[PDB]
């Protein structure tokens, strides 16, 4: 569980994301799909994208990036009280979309990467750690719902 100061650092960093949610969303998904090509393969609507240039040109990928980070913002603002988001997201991601927990780790790595690549001057090591802990908390809670379902 995060401290009050850790949550405050998480949500302060998140303010930077909200100044350009679309640009953030696009860069996180590009980082994910290029760094871990298996992840792109799970997304039927984006698997036609073959280069970084095609990815950057897709208005739909940019939209989806906005939708995903907006949903993540919603979760982070609950400061761990996100139980109501767990079954639905685990259910869509485990059951509908067959997304391993490992891929959730990859997008967490991507978020941290893109956050540091844009906000060097805020997202110092301590803020990185707090953000990592917030992302890990959500993933750990999703993992228990994957285990409940027997996902493989």
Cα–Cα nearest to 110, from 81, 68, 75: 68
Q: What's the CA gap between 65 and 141, in Å, rounded?
A: 22
Which 8-state DSSP code applies to residue 95? I
The conformational region for residue 126 under phi > 0 = left, psi -120 to 50 = alpha, else beta, is alpha
Query: Is residue 69 within 8 Å of residue 21, measured between CB atoms?
Result: yes
Residue nearest to Na ion (CB): 92
Binding mask 29-68 toward Na ion (x if CB under 5 A, else -) reads ----------------------------------------
Q: Binding to ligand NO2 by residue 109, rule CB under 6 A?
A: yes
Pattern 54-93, ligand NO2, x by CB under 6 A: ----------x---x--x-----------------x----
- Which positions lie near ligand NO2, rule CB under 6 A? 31, 35, 64, 68, 71, 89, 109-110, 113
């Amino acid at each position: 569980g995060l401290s009050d100061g850790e949550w405050q650092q998480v949500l302060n960093v998140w303010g930077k994301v909200e100044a350009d949610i679309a640009g953030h969303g696009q860069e996180v998904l590009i980082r994910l799909f290029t760094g871990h090509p298996e992840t792109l393969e799970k997304f039927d609507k984006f698997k036609h994208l073959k280069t970084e240039a095609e990815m950057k040109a897709s208005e739909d990928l940019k939209k989806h990036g906005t939708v995903v980070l907006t949903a993540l913002g919603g979760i982070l603002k609950k400061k761990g009280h996100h139980e109501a988001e767990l079954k639905p997201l685990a259910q869509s991601h485990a059951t509908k979309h067959k997304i391993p927990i490992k891929y959730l780790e990859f997008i967490s790595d991507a978020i941290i990467h893109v956050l540091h690549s844009k906000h060097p001057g805020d997202f110092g090591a301590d803020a990185q750690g707090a953000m990592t802990k917030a992302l890990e908390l959500f993933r750990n809670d999703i993992a228990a719902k994957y285990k409940e379902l027997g996902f493989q």
